[PDB]
Amino acid sequence: FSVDAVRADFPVLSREVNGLPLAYLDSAASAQKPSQVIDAEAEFYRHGYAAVHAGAHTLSAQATEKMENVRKRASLFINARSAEELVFVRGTTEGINLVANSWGNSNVRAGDNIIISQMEHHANIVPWQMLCARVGAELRVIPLNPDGTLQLETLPTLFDAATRLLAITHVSNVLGTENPLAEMITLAHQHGAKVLVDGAQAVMHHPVDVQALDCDFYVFSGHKLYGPTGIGILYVKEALLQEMPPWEGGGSMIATVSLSEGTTWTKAPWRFEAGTPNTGGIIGLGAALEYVSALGLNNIAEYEQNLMHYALSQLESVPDLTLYGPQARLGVIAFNLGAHHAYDVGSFLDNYGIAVRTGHHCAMPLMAYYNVPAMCRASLAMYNTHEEVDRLVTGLQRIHRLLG
Amino acid sequence: FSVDAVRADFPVLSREVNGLPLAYLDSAASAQKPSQVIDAEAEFYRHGYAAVHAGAHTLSAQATEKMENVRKRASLFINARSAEELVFVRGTTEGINLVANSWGNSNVRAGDNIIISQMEHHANIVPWQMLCARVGAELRVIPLNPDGTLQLETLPTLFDAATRLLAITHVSNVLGTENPLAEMITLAHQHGAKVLVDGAQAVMHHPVDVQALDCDFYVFSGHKLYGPTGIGILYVKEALLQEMPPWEGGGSMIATVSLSEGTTWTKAPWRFEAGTPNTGGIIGLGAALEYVSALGLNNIAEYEQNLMHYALSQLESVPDLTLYGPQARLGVIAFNLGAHHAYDVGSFLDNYGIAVRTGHHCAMPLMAYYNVPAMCRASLAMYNTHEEVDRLVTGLQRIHRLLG
Ligand SMILES: *Cc1c(COP(=O)(O)O)cnc(C)c1O
Ligand SMILES: *Cc1c(COP(=O)(O)O)cnc(C)c1O
Numbered sequence: 001f002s003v004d005a006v007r008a009d010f011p012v013l014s015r016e017v018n019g020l021p022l023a024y025l026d027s028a029a030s031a032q033k034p035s036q037v038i039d040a041e042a043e044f045y046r047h048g049y050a051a052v053h054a055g056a057h058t059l060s061a062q063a064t065e066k067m068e069n070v071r072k073r074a075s076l077f078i079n080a081r082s083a084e085e086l087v088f089v090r091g092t093t094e095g096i097n098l099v100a101n102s103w104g105n106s107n108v109r110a111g112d113n114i115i116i117s118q119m120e121h122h123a124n125i126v127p128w129q130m131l132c133a134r135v136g137a138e139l140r141v142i143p144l145n146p147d148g149t150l151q152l153e154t155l156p157t158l159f160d161a162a163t164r165l166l167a168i169t170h171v172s173n174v175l176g177t178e179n180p181l182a183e184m185i186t187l188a189h190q191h192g193a194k195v196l197v198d199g200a201q202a203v204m205h206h207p208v209d210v211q212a213l214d215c216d217f218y219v220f221s222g223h224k225l226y227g228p229t230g231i232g233i234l235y236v237k238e239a240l241l242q243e244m245p246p247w248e249g250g251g252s253m254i255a256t257v258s259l260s261e262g263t264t265w266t267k268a269p270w271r272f273e274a275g276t277p278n279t280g281g282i283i284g285l286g287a288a289l290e291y292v293s294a295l296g297l298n299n300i301a302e303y304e305q306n307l308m309h310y311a312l313s314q315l316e317s318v319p320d321l322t323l324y325g326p327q328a329r330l331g332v333i334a335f336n337l338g339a340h341h342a343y344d345v346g347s348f349l350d351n352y353g354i355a356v357r358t359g360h361h362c363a364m365p366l367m368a369y370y371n372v373p374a375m376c377r378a379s380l381a382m383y384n385t386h387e388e389v390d391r392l393v394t395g396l397q398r399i400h401r402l403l404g
Numbered sequence: 405f406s407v408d409a410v411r412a413d414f415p416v417l418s419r420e421v422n423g424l425p426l427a428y429l430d431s432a433a434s435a436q437k438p439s440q441v442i443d444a445e446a447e448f449y450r451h452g453y454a455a456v457h458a459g460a461h462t463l464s465a466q467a468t469e470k471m472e473n474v475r476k477r478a479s480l481f482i483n484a485r486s487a488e489e490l491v492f493v494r495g496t497t498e499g500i501n502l503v504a505n506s507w508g509n510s511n512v513r514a515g516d517n518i519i520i521s522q523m524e525h526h527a528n529i530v531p532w533q534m535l536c537a538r539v540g541a542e543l544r545v546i547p548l549n550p551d552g553t554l555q556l557e558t559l560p561t562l563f564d565a566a567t568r569l570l571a572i573t574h575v576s577n578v579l580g581t582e583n584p585l586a587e588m589i590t591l592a593h594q595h596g597a598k599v600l601v602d603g604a605q606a607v608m609h610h611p612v613d614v615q616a617l618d619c620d621f622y623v624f625s626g627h628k629l630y631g632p633t634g635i636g637i638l639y640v641k642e643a644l645l646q647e648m649p650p651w652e653g654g655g656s657m658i659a660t661v662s663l664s665e666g667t668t669w670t671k672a673p674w675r676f677e678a679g680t681p682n683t684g685g686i687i688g689l690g691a692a693l694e695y696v697s698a699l700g701l702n703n704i705a706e707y708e709q710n711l712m713h714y715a716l717s718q719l720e721s722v723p724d725l726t727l728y729g730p731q732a733r734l735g736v737i738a739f740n741l742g743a744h745h746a747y748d749v750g751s752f753l754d755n756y757g758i759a760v761r762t763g764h765h766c767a768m769p770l771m772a773y774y775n776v777p778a779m780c781r782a783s784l785a786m787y788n789t790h791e792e793v794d795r796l797v798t799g800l801q802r803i804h805r806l807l808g
Binding site for chain 2: 017018030035041045046090091122129130141221230231253254259263275276279347357358359364365
């Protein structure tokens with residue numbers, strides 16, 4: 001793995017944010033895209049665009065073929081049993097919202113309980129709160145530990161006969177923690193409960209095998225996987241998918257439409273994709289899938305791990321720095337400088353040309369646990385360098401001496 | 405207006421489908437995009453991509469500014485009162501599905517009735533059938549006339565005290581008919597009913613003033629307006645929007661999230677946009693809006709009208725040709741050749757390098773009225789020429805002599 005080679009594929013990296021070379025340390029919010037991806041979509045629009053609904057003419061017939069191919073490619077990326085188990089969604093948020101509405105509204109009756117963690121992203125909280133609101137079910141939360149890990153010992157007190165589904169994050173977007181999915185997956189199954197894994201921040205750091213994990217639902221966004229915005233993958237077990245009813249109607253998710261005999265629906269996954277798809281985005285996601293897989297997630301893993309174990313080392317030279325989460329974090333570093341608000345700290349780093357995320361990172365609940373209104377988030381991707389890490393620590397030291 | 409100039413902006417037009425110059429006569433399904441648009445998005449990804457959630461660093465702060473700007477631009481395109489009246493959706497289908505779910509589920513109680521036409525697209529039928537299914541309301545259909553127009557005389561028998569909303573198409577995607585919205589809008593209002601206008605096939609042919617129309621809901625897709633896929637605009641009266649509850653949750657449509665005190669929602673339109681937006685698509689839609697507005701919808705109208713009134717003239721020389729719809733159609737021509745199925749006719753035209761749409765065009769109900777299983781659809785856009793029209797008629801004559 002060679003950063004120099006990689007970074008050469010991302011044009012934005014050669015940018016100058018504030019008269020100073022840009023240091024994009026905020027990929028956890030949204031990764032930058034490589035040329036291969038950017039052009040892959042641009043070419044599609046330039047030499048072969050058309051409607052992807054198995055039309056008559058070659059252009060449309062071919063676009064459809066392209067579309068379906070990406071679906072297969074993605075199916076291999078996460079090792080899905082069959083491509084028909086993958087549904088195209090705008091992103092992780094819509095993905096969960098689809099499951100909650102379709103599968104939730106017909107499996108979680110009033111009285112039952114749903115389990116989610118305390119480190120979950122708002123996209124894996126609200127949709128569930130809404131379900132419980134209308135269905136009349138109870139929402140249970142898995143407590144957290146100071147080191148940013150889950151209080152697993154409290155599992156037996158949460159899992160019971162009325163537990164229907166377990167919505168948990170693969171990796172944390174703030175603490176970088178990687179939950180013990182495998183084991184938790186079986187436990188929830190032992191009680192006959194389903195498990196929805198929100199791996200929006202896992203797919204880009206290392207390999208994922210939905211077959212080995214045995215999860216019933218798995219979602220992730222493309223724009224974070226060095227792909228285009230507006231596209232995401234929703235994976236649901238064939239067995240479960242075939243039984244799920246539609247959520248969005250109209251478009252081409254119907255098999256027949258009669259104003260008298262009523263309308264029928266097609267088979268999954270197409271049943272869950274009404275209206276014209278995001279063809280462009282699909283094409284883009286494919287190139288991203290290809291690009292990343294080319295480098296090897298295991299290689300990207302090794303490099304990213306090294307850079308991290310280095311960033312944590314240097315980050316120690318910084319005084320008054322308070323870190324949140326385990327030492328075995330993933331591509332994310334949540335910290336805070338003494339008593340200064342992340343707003344100001346992050347605002348200063350920007351002046352130095354560093355891109356860091358400040359705020360609650362759509363995880364308000366998690367913040368309340370640490371009694372902090374908000375923290376700073378420095379992400380380390382495959383195109384990031386040690387020099388950038390240094391550029392970060394130094395700036396932190398500077399803002400310390402200046403602000404106090 | 406100069407086609408030669410325009411066509412020079414669309415690279416796909418210089419393509420060769422089947423060894424023969426391509427003749428894209430299927431823009432009604434999805435328009436082709438001009439370079440300005442294709443690059444506008446590509447550049448964004450290349451020199452200034454970032455998360456659009458009012459982040460700290462300049463890149464994200466600026467992306468957000470860009471995003472909101474497009475929203476304003478679009479607000480001016482359809483003459484919305486305020487940009488806060490526009491919601492970003494994947495397309496017309498999701499737009500309607502949003503209204504049906506959010507506004508429908510809380511305004512149409514069991515017993516009430518909803519009115520839709522018989523020429524409506526499946527995207528403006530199914531979502532309503534689903535609402536009536538759960539709410540327990542009654543769905544009423546406005547009969548059609550042989551010339552492909554609405555049987556307005558049957559209006560007083562449909563509109564009553566229990567009529568809540570009127571979902572109608574601005575223009576037909578099969579007949580090219582342009583319904584008398586203005587008048588129908590007032591009638592539905594006189595009874596206190598709302599009106600949702602599906603103008604997915606109107607925005608690109610001529611100007612639209614949601615303020616003059618006084619509709620309460622208006623939707624359209626970008627990919628048909630020479631824009632990128634995966635992006636669309638949903639316009640709803642401020643007054644109504646502010647009262648509508650959320651549909652999709654999580655992301656950034658919340659104001660506060662508490663596992664104990666519960667969560668709250670932000671104000672519209674942001675309240676209806678959970679999760680990371682389709683930033684790329686938004687940027688693209690802007691360029692499209694700009695490109696089209698530059699040429700002048702009124703000019704594009706004049707040219708498109710001429711080409712049509714010419715295509716209809718030549719289309720007469722073709723024997724056994726059966727046309728559907730009025731003589732005052734819009735950018736669309738639905739026909740059929742004698743007794744040959746559109747499949748074969750359209751398949752032959754492709755061999756000649758012509759891109760035409762065959763099937764039911766997601767309007768099964770409309771077909772049943774004409775007792776036809778499917779028809780052919782030739783669309784005439786701003787970049788289409790008389791030579792193409794000729795290339796079409798001639799091919800029709802050929803397939804006639806050959807097939808019979
Ligand atoms: C094309 C069309 C739609 C579907 O729009 P999408 O962008 O595919 O969701 C809905 N209604 C009408 C009248 C259309 O022409
Ligand atoms: C980023 C993220 C999301 C939101 O995904 P979008 O693509 O913005 O819809 C949800 N869950 C987790 C864990 C995330 O990291």
